[PDB]
Amino acid sequence: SRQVVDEINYKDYKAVTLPFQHNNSGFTGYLAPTMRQGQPYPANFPYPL
């Protein structure tokens, strides 16, 4: 089993597609195993359950 965010029935759910997802920004390559890119920033992607 798993729980996941309710996509219907949650007034603030937004559909962020892969290129726009960030977590560990500044500390990972952009969409690749290539060297780290970007800046530190609050992560947006996985909503807390």
């Binding site: 996509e7 219907i8 029935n9 007034k11």
Partner: protein, 39 residues
């Protein structure tokens, strides 16, 4: 050959299938957002 037109209108049917799935995903979100706003 019939394949060109049979492919055309099966492509038309999947385009109108993909229309209703994309657009029922809109109404479900909307009626649920209004149910939430009234809740």
């Amino acid at each position: 050959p019939s394949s060109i037109i049979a492919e055309e209108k099966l492509l038309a049917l999947l385009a109108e299938l993909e229309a209703l799935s994309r657009q029922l995903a809109a109404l479900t979100q909307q009626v649920s957002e209004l149910r939430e706003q009234q809740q």
